[PDB]
Amino acid sequence: ATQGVFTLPANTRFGVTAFANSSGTQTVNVLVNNETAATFSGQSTNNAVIGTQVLNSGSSGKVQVQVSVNGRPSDLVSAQVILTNELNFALVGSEDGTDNDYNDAVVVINWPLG
Amino acid sequence: ATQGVFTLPANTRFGVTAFANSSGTQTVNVLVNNETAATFSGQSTNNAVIGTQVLNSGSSGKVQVQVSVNGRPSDLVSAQVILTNELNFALVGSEDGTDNDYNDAVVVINWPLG
Amino acid sequence: ATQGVFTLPANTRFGVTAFANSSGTQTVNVLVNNETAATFSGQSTNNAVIGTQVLNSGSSGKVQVQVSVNGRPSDLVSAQVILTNELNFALVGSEDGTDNDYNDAVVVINWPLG
Amino acid sequence: ATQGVFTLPANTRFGVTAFANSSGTQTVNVLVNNETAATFSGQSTNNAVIGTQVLNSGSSGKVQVQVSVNGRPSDLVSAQVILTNELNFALVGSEDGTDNDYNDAVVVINWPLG
Amino acid sequence: XXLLXCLXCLLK
Amino acid sequence: XXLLXCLXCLLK
Amino acid sequence: CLXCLLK
Ligand SMILES: [Ca+2]
Ligand SMILES: [Ca+2]
Ligand SMILES: [Ca+2]
Ligand SMILES: [Ca+2]
Ligand SMILES: [Ca+2]
Ligand SMILES: [Ca+2]
Ligand SMILES: [Ca+2]
Ligand SMILES: [Ca+2]
């Protein structure tokens, strides 16, 4: 199944934050209405924030996370969880290799903000 | 029910990161083995990262997140989510006021690292 | 924080199912648009389904789960989870006593159907 | 990434329950320690429970859900969610066709029991 | 179900 | 953040 | 692994 695609409420500001746990330099692309809205890129094996940004979900509300290392797409896993019917997390993990720890880039999307 | 308390695998390194969405200054305390291991502080209404750190879950693995604003404890919501039986997220929302958006301090714990 | 309250897409069919793990007889009430729409009841310490029913989320989409034992409201915990941006679970646990296993009545709401 | 595989605490009783939302007859197999422990089958487009059982996670704790329709394996999505650090759900959705509603067989695994 | 299981069922 | 933000920011 | 041994 498709992973890393979330339907947000339309026109809503949301946070996106990326952490790195890999020898490879991670590139995180955040797409909004099928166009690249943000791109983070960094390297760490110790969970460093390689990017954080507040974006707008746009008229469609559709947000997609894509991860790649040296042009190779990472395998994604994802889910969305909602706490007390209000606080939303969209969670992405990614594996750029063979050890299958799926933390090589970790992406957290949260809303609402403010 | 108790919220903000997670049993991690023992002696395991994890990432802990806090975001703020509130006019009030947020204080986020992370206890390991019932003792403070990190304290984050900051103010933002734009989802700013007010703290990020790697800690060790210790011999018990018990990790507790506490949130307060000018000394007033916030109401907490929390849950743990596991993706592909490997990638863990412990998630906390907090409410310091009356509007109940539960994003005033948002805390994300993730593991494994590396 | 409020638990057991979920905002489904309006006018949508959903399933609600309840399991029992307690010596006390569980009473699960499902409210739609703040009016009782289904009530399950039963006792089991072996996870017996005490009820399962298809309901319509109504014009508001507001679904509430309430659990009591012998007139006494159980403490509730809940979350919502979405898989591949389509499949929804609203999850409820409840505690009627002091051992805090929070399984005394377990309620699973899923959608879409069909 | 692998889906439908969960590491439970070893030698623990857990409930597993399957729902059907498809014109195709669902076959749900539940493996413990890579051996089939339970098999559910039924057809419904209205979320009928086609199986519920209590199983033991065994010495490894490894529980796998497999879904097929007339022998054709279904595409799986899955995650595990933990409430108040105690109540565990392992969730499976499956898709047997082209509409991608991933509700054709829905499987819920919950623990602890009793 | 043993002493406890009886008390349980009995009292509730 | 406007008259709203300023009050909030001031008082807290 | 030698590739990894260089990490
Ligand atoms: Ca990896
Ligand atoms: Ca890694
Ligand atoms: Ca608030
Ligand atoms: Ca807020
Ligand atoms: Ca109990
Ligand atoms: Ca119980
Ligand atoms: Ca389908
Ligand atoms: Ca279907």
Author numbering:
A (entry chain A), B (entry chain C), C (entry chain D), D (entry chain B): 1 to 114
E (entry chain H), F (entry chain G): 103 to 114
G (entry chain E): 7 to 13
Publication passage describing the model:
Herein we report the first X-ray crystal structures of mixed chirality α-helices in short peptides comprising only natural residues as the example of a stapled bicyclic and a linear membrane disruptive amphiphilic antimicrobial peptide (AMP) containing seven l- and four d-residues, as complexes of fucosylated analogs with the bacterial lectin LecB. The mixed chirality α-helices are superimposable onto the homochiral α-helices and form under similar conditions as shown by CD spectra and MD simulations but non-hemolytic and resistant to proteolysis. To get a direct insight into the structure of AMBP bp65/bp69 and their linear analogs ln65/ln69, we performed several crystallization studies using either the compounds themselves or their racemates to be crystallized as pure compounds, or their fucosylated derivatives of both mirror image peptides as complexes with the P. aeruginosa lectin LecB. While previous reports of similar mixed chirality AMPs concluded on either unordered conformations or helical conformations appearing in a membrane environment based on deconvolution of FTIR spectra, here we reported X-ray crystallographic evidence of short mixed chirality helices consisting of only natural residues existing as helix bundles within the protein environment of a lectin and almost perfectly superimposable with their parent homochiral α-helices. These direct observations unequivocally demonstrate that the α-helical fold with only natural residues can sometimes tolerate multiple stereochemical inversions without significant conformational changes.
For the mixed chirality AMBP bp69, we obtained two crystal structures of lectin LecB complexed with bp71, an analog of the mixed chirality AMBP bp69 with an additional side-chain fucosylated lysine at the C-terminus. The six individual structures of the mixed chirality AMBP featured essentially the same double-stapled amphiphilic α-helix as that observed in the parent homochiral AMBP structures. Remarkably, the ten crystallographically non-equivalent stapled bicyclic α-helices observed in the X-ray structures of the homochiral rac-bp65 and bp70, and the mixed chirality bp71·LecB complex were essentially superimposable, with RMSD < 0.6 Å for the peptide backbones. In the case of bp65, bp71 and Fln65 the peptides were aggregated in bundles of four of more helices via hydrophobic contacts between leucine side chains. A closer analysis of the different X-ray structures showed that the peptides did not make any significant contact with LecB apart from the anchoring fucose residue. By investigating the structure of AMPBs we discovered the mixed chirality sequence bp69 containing seven l- and four d-residues folding into an amphiphilic α-helix within a stapled bicyclic peptide similar to the parent all l-AMBP bp65.
